[PDB]
Motif scaffolding. Structure first.
Motif, PDB file in Angstrom:
ATOM      1  N   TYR A  85       0.794  -1.225   0.000  1.00  0.00           N
ATOM      2  CA  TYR A  85       0.000   0.000   0.000  1.00  0.00           C
ATOM      3  C   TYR A  85       0.828   1.277   0.000  1.00  0.00           C
ATOM      4  O   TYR A  85       0.261   2.362   0.161  1.00  0.00           O
ATOM      5  N   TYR A  89       0.820   4.221   4.406  1.00  0.00           N
ATOM      6  CA  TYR A  89      -0.360   3.352   4.612  1.00  0.00           C
ATOM      7  C   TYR A  89      -1.036   3.744   5.920  1.00  0.00           C
ATOM      8  O   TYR A  89      -0.357   4.299   6.800  1.00  0.00           O
ATOM      9  N   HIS A 156      -9.434  -0.019  -2.144  1.00  0.00           N
ATOM     10  CA  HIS A 156      -8.097   0.448  -1.713  1.00  0.00           C
ATOM     11  C   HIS A 156      -7.737  -0.322  -0.445  1.00  0.00           C
ATOM     12  O   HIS A 156      -7.509  -1.538  -0.585  1.00  0.00           O
ATOM     13  N   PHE A 157      -7.550   0.330   0.716  1.00  0.00           N
ATOM     14  CA  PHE A 157      -6.965  -0.289   1.911  1.00  0.00           C
ATOM     15  C   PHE A 157      -7.897  -1.330   2.534  1.00  0.00           C
ATOM     16  O   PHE A 157      -9.074  -1.056   2.781  1.00  0.00           O
TER      17      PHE A 157
END
Ligand SMILES: CC(C)CCC[C@@H](C)[C@H]1CC[C@H]2[C@@H]3CC=C4C[C@@H](O)CC[C@]4(C)[C@H]3CC[C@]12C
Ligand SMILES: CC(C)CCC[C@@H](C)[C@H]1CC[C@H]2[C@@H]3CC=C4C[C@@H](O)CC[C@]4(C)[C@H]3CC[C@]12C
Ligand SMILES: CC(C)CCC[C@@H](C)[C@H]1CC[C@H]2[C@@H]3CC=C4C[C@@H](O)CC[C@]4(C)[C@H]3CC[C@]12C
Length: 1350
Positions: A85, A89, A156-157
């Motif tokens: 990431y 992150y 995404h995360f």
């Protein structure tokens, strides 16, 4: 295909940056064991990524040893996240440890839904690390199922689901081990039978740590390492660790016990089963004040534990019971979630409650409360802290909390923190800025560095538009457009450079003025300084919020500050220009861009709206506000800003137009029509005194105001240009003389003056590019050029007739341009001006008509000319013949008589009896042509005009309204004198410039508005801004869509209330359905170094029974044998028992409460214990022969809930006593000690209570403690079942109870374990207590006397 990683960014131990190192270098620190016998081990060759069926992403796996550092494993997880990431992150603010049942279990769907919803919300809001066992059974599999939907529904995360598992039980370990590491995307076959393991890994876990010790099929090797890793992660990220207990077997109880003991809070899910239901009952028994828990008893809990876990032995049941009651002792560390009490959507609130009860400080609790988006909780916490005198901690943490609220985009929290007396301009950066050589940068306050930190933090995120904007801007650090490097990069997002970037975004001459000198402490005494400091600070934060496109916080800072209208226009311009920029282009940036445009429009609306409100309230005061010059934007008004922001909507508004037309006429009443100003111009002394006016002091002032008005300069320029047109028209019509005439010289002087004015405007005003852009300047240049060509043509040879003819020919074009230029002054009129703009729009239709006619004109013309004259050589006359008559026949002048003469037709009928028959086709061609040109093309031009007119009439009106200000601004700066005389004005300006630059004998004077009128304008603008927002909100709530949506939500809430009603209904259905003793001490003597007594059964203990087989061991402890002050002598001769005996003249209690009394052995003189045999002679650990008098102090209070109601169990009120945990054997006990020489139980009790419960020991609290200690009752004097007791030394206790009926005095005690006690706490009295010696009998006596629960 996935390329294998070769280098990894490992975070440093300092926590400042990551260093890049090879993967094979980093992994060497993890070890593996080939066999159980091996201790040192060998490096791990089992690490890489695993690919699981039906899962898109791969999960990293590291096999590490039991002796390996958990910090290294933490570094491994950080390195994986940093690779996947990026460096920036989302760090975890929460560690969620999931423990519980290893075996498979089924939960109820609503309970599972509630846990899943709460856990997903908590995990996605806090970016939490969830640590489980990693296996595909039970609670681990359940947690995997919960996080699977989080990994699918969110982009995404994705928060990691770390699984720490023992390697000795895992299917497929040999496959994972053998190979050359790293194994990228290795297939895991969970259903393959790998002998002899039957345990598979959960496929939904995102990482795996396989802890190996060389054993096989022996579960539980990793429990400690897991605890150490969670604690290490919690210390490293400064994040609370929250354990969640669902289901759970016998080991889960010990795990939870370990968790409480280490200070980690637990959240127990009630209704799940086993350890969790047992724990939930137990807490509810020991803390919950509700009526339905008043029937809770230990017997029913014991029954529940026996029916659920089914122990083999009673001692196992007793140990489980003791551990279960020991877990829920501290109410802060245990949070029980129940469906029937809290609610379905209250599990994240329970997690937040555990967090707030865990770490006790205002800053950590507010930061976590922000993360979970619970404002009410934060508001209640702030209010409670405010009421309880904790204002200092609030003020100490409010800045950091406000900073955090700004970073994470929480405007409601920003509003809260700002409401509790937190000054906006008192922000401080988290890090410390290094010193800089630039004096402008060093002058900057702390809050500027805080805004710089917000820009830097947002900019370091991947694909951020801020970094692209700053890089593409091509400027230096202070923002100047000039394009060392290290400063220019470490402080690249300073506030001055950002101010410059926004200034270029608005227009080419926008320059925002900052004044940071007012933030020094010397200006604090100036009245209203706090507002100014606020306003500036607000503005800077406002601009930052415009840049990140956060509309809600932007709107909040816009409303806090002042100059609302101008800020809304500036915001609209910056967002509109920013949305169409090179820094925002990209496939992924599309939606935000869209958002920007939307936001832009909204701000524009605001700018119009507030203004409108002003015009409704006071037109004159609104006019005064629009004319106000503001210092922050280089001293010019709101209309100038609006023009620079290209806000067409603002300029077309009636209020703005009224001020522009008020600026016109130079602020006078009677000056309204053309004729009035014209009559007043020519006749100054005969119309001005007898007219409304807004001595030589006044007449001169009015004359200077009237002739300083822009309208008057327009009137002077018109009259001047009209004379020029009339004089030049006579000059070109009248014949030229043989020399240069007087009128020619006058025109020569006039056009030089015009040429000098055009040159002066080019060099000294806008720029050459700006001048050429205008069409009227080009016309001005063409007219001056034509006159000079014609004049020099005549003046070269004045007596030449040909020169006179050519000169008049050039000057014909000159007169045409001069009369065409006169139209420029029609643009000021509200009727002629928009129509002129419409004419310029219709020119494209005119061009379309010209292109279509040209086709028919040249086709018909060549054909007709050839047909009329078929035997003629081509010449210039042929070409004129092709264009002359064809063009003029479309206007109705048909040259049929001329055509008849040219065709040589001699007949009376027009084209009969001709020489050639082909020329008789000449009228037919013509017949087609005028059908094409007059009936078809002219009528289509009429149709195109009507359509074009209807389309562009409103846009032409708006464009005329912008040009109204442009013309007003243009004739404001113009030279005062008209054209022939402007040369005098030119020489006057040159004289002033020479006197100012070289001589320096004069300056500029102006007038500045007073502070009273400034604050009056400010108050009006703020009041109308609030009024417009209230009206706007009410109007948006009265729309049909909003009403349909609100009624729909109300019907949804109505069903929710019916669902609650149905729950209460089913509860009645259930309710209606159900409506129809001898003590023997342990063998090993305490603190004797393993010396053991002579063991005896409990049926042989009494002294009445004979028992001839009795051979006790004589043992005396070293501490007693060293002879201290409180210990009796080793030889018990001359001492009198059964009466109060005097040692060193002080009386001690040597009399026992036993009815038989103390018997004296004849052989040795030692006393004999009346309470039975203990299998040991001598004194042992006890210092006094016979009765060792002890005093115990039971300080009690009623256990009360916050609401004030007394807790009730088994129909009796429950007591609560201060209990201490002993230092020697770590068992809880009643505070107390031996009665000293010369003192009574009162003093002994008080001294022991002060020593144990309080430790070191005021004012009022001492008075409360003295008041509580003044009323003590000796409740019992009994024999202690103390394990240090022997046959010649036994403990006898006096119990003193100090009860606090109101509870006021007891509440002021700060309990802290001291001397021979480890911890002291208030503990509820019950019959299931595992306390030291016979203290349960003493509490039983206290509860018996007070009619309390036991
Ligand atoms: C830009 C526009 C407005 C200007 C047009 C240019 C005018 C002023 C110039 C361009 C060409 C010129 C013509 C060129 C040639 C001749 C032939 C000569 O025996 C008499 C003058 C006469 C007829 C000139 C008159 C002026 C003229 C028409
Ligand atoms: C071209 C399309 C649109 C229609 C065709 C009509 C043309 C071909 C017709 C219409 C009128 C006609 C003309 C009318 C009368 C005469 C007189 C005759 O003694 C010789 C031919 C002549 C001069 C014709 C030539 C052909 C003519 C020009
Ligand atoms: C409704 C409209 C289109 C009516 C049509 C009118 C047409 C058919 C008429 C109008 C004028 C006429 C022309 C007038 C004169 C002459 C010259 C003659 O020597 C031959 C016929 C000729 C060339 C005619 C042909 C037909 C003509 C073109």
């Amino acid at each position: 295909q996935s390329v294998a990683a070769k280098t990894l960014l490992i975070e440093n131990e300092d926590g400042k940056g990551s260093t890049r190192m090879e993967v094979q270098d980093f992994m060497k620190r993890f070890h593996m064991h080939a066999s159980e016998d091996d201790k040192t081990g060998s490096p791990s060759t089992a690490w890489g990524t695993l690919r699981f069926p039906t899962k898109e992403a791969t999960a990293p796996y590291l096999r590490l040893s039991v002796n390996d550092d958990p910090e290294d494993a933490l570094l491994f997880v950080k390195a994986m996240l940093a690779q996947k990431y990026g460096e920036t992150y989302d760090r975890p603010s929460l560690i969620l440890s999931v423990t519980g049942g290893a075996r498979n279990f089924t939960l109820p769907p609503r309970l599972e839904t509630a846990i899943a919803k709460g856990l997903r919300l908590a995990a996605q809001r806090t970016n939490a690390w969830v640590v489980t066992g990693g296996t595909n059974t039970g609670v681990m599999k359940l947690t995997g199922q919960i996080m699977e939907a989080l990994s699918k529904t969110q982009s995404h995360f994705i928060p990691p689901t770390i699984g720490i598992a023992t390697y000795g039980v895992i299917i497929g370990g040999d496959d994972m081990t053998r190979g050359e590491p790293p194994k990228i995307g290795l297939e895991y076959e969970m259903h393959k039978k790998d002998p002899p393991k039957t345990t598979p890994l959960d496929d939904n876990h995102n990482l795996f740590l396989l802890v190996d010790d060389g054993s096989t099929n022996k579960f539980g090797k990793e429990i400690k390492f897991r605890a150490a890793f969670e604690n290490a992660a919690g210390q490293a990220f400064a994040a609370p660790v929250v354990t969640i207990v669902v289901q759970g077997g016998p080991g889960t109880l010990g795990t939870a016990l370990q968790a409480v003991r280490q200070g980690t809070p637990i959240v127990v899910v009630d209704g799940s089963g086993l350890a969790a239901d047992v724990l939930a009952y137990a807490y509810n028994f020991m803390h919950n004040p509700l009526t339905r828990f008043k029937s809770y008893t230990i017997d029913d809990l014991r029954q529940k534990v026996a029916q659920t876990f089914n122990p083999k032995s009673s001692q196992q049941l007793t140990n489980l019971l003791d551990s279960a009651l020991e877990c829920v002792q501290d109410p802060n560390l245990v949070v029980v979630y129940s469906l029937q009490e809290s609610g379905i959507d209250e599990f994240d609130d329970c997690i937040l409650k555990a967090i707030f009860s865990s770490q006790g400080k205002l800053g950590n609790k507010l930061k976590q409360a922000m993360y979970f988006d619970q404002l009410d909780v934060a508001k209640r916490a702030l209010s409670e802290a405010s009421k309880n005198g904790q204002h200092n901690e609030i003020a100490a943490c409010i800045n950091d909390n406000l900073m955090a609220a700004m970073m994470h985009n929480k405007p409601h929290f920003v509003e809260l923190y700002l409401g509790f007396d937190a000054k906006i301009y008192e922000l401080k950066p988290s890090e410390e800025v290094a010193k800089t050589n630039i004096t402008a940068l060093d002058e900057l306050p702390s809050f500027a560095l805080a805004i710089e930190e917000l820009y830097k933090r947002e900019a370091k995120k991947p694909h951020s538009h801020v970094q692209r904007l700053v890089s593409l801007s091509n400027t230096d650090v202070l923002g100047r457009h000039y394009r060392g490097r290290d400063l220019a990069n470490t402080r690249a997002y300073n506030v001055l450079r950002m101010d410059q970037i926004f200034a270029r975004l608005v227009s080419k001459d926008f320059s925002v003025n900052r004044d940071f000198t007012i933030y020094d402490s010397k200006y604090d005494k100036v009245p209203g300084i706090q507002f100014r400091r606020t306003a500036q600070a607000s503005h800077m934060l406002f601009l930052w919020a415009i840049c990140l496109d956060r509309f809600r916080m932007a709107r909040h800072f816009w409303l806090i500050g002042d100059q609302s209208i101008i800020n809304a226009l500036v915001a609209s311009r910056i967002l509109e220009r920013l949305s169409t920029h090179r820094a925002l282009q990209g496939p992924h940036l599309a939606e935000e861009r869209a958002k920007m445009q939307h936001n832009a429009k909204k701000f524009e609306e605001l700018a119009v709206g507030v203004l409108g409100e002003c015009h409704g309230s006071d037109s004159h005061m609104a006019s005064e506000m629009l004319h106000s010059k503001n210092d922050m934007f280089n001293k010019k008004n709101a209309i100038n800003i609006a023009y620079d922001a290209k806000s067409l909507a603002f300029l077309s508004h009636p209020a703005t137009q009224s001020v522009i037309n008020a600026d016109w006429y130079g602020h006078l009443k009677s000056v309204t029509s053309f004729w009035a100003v014209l009559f007043a111009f020519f006749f100054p002394f005969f119309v001005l005194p007898f007219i409304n006016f807004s001595g030589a002091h006044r007449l001169r002032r009015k004359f200077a105001k009237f002739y300083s008005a822009p309208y008057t300069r327009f009137i002077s320029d018109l009259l001047s240009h009209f004379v020029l047109c009339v004089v030049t028209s006579y000059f070109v019509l009248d014949k030229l003389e043989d020399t240069i005439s007087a009128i020619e010289w006058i025109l020569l002087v006039w056009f030089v003056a015009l040429l000098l004015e055009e040159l002066r405007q080019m060099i000294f005003c806008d720029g050459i590019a700006e001048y050429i852009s205008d069409t009227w300047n080009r016309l001005d240049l063409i007219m001056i050029t034509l006159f000079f060509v014609g004049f020099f043509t005549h003046a070269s040879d004045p007596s030449n007739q040909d020169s006179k003819v050519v000169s008049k020919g050039i000057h014909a074009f000159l007169v045409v341009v001069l009369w065409l230029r006169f139209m420029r002054y029609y643009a000021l009129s509200k009727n002629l001006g928009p129509k002129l703009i419409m004419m310029m729009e219709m020119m494209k239709d005119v061009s379309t008509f010209v292109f279509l006619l040209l086709i028919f004109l040249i086709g018909y013309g060549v054909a007709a000319q050839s047909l009329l004259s078929p035997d003629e050589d081509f010449s210039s006359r042929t070409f004129i013949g092709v264009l002359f008559r064809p063009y003029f026949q479309i206007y109705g002048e048909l040259f049929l008589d001329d055509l008849n003469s040219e065709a040589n037709c001699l007949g009376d009928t027009p084209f009969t009896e001709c020489s050639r028959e082909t020329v008789r086709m000449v009228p037919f061609f013509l017949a087609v042509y005028i059908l094409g040109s007059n009936v078809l093309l002219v009528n289509l031009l009429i149709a195109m005009f009507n359509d074009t007119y209807m389309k562009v009439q409103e846009a032409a009106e708006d464009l005329w309204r912008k040009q109204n200000y442009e013309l007003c601004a243009e004739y404001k700066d113009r030279p005062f004198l008209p054209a022939p005389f402007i040369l005098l004005a030119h020489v006057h300006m040159l004289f002033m410039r020479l006197l100012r630059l070289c001589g320096v004998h004069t300056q500029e004077h102006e007038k500045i508005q007073d502070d009273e009128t400034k604050r009056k304008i400010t108050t009006f603008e703020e009041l109308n801004t609030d009024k417009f927002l209230r009206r706007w909100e009410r109007e948006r709530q009265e729309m049909l869509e909003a009403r349909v949506k609100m009624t729909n939500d109300n019907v949804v809430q109505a069903m929710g209330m019916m669902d609650q009603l149905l729950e209460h209904m089913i509860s009645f259905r259930f309710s209606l359905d159900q409506q129809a003793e001898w003590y023997v001490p342990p063998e090993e003597y305490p603190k004797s170094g393993g010396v053991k007594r002579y063991l005896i059964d409990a049926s042989m203990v009494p002294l009445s029974i004979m028992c001839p087989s009795y051979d006790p061991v004589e043992y005396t402890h070293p501490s007693v044998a060293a002879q201290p002050v409180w210990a009796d002598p080793a030889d018990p001769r001359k001492i009198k028992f059964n009466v109060k005996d005097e040692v060193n003249g002080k009386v001690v209690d040597r009399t026992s409460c036993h009815p038989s009394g103390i018997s004296i052995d004849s052989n040795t003189g030692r006393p004999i214990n009346p309470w039975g045999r203990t299998g040991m002679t001598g004194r042992g650990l006890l210092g006094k022969w016979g009765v060792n008098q002890a005093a115990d102090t039971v300080v009690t209070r009623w256990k009360r809930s916050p609401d004030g109601s007394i807790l009730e169990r088994d129909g009796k009120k429950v007591l609560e006593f201060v209990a201490i945990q002993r230092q020697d054997n770590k068992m809880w006990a009643i505070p107390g000690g031996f009665v000293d020489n010369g003192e009574d139980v009162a003093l002994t009790s008080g001294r022991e209570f002060m020593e144990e419960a309080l430790g070191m020991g005021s004012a009022e609290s001492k008075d409360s403690l003295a008041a509580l200690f003044s009323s003590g009752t000796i409740v019992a004097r009994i024999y202690c079942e103390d394990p240090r007791n022997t046959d010649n030394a036994w403990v006898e206790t006096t119990c003193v109870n100090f009860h606090d009926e109101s509870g006021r005095h007891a509440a002021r005690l700060k309990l802290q374990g001291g001397d021979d006690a480890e911890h002291a706490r208030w503990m509820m009295v019950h019959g299931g207590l595992n306390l030291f010696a016979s203290h349960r009998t003493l509490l039983q006596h206290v509860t018996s006397a007070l009619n309390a629960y036991f």
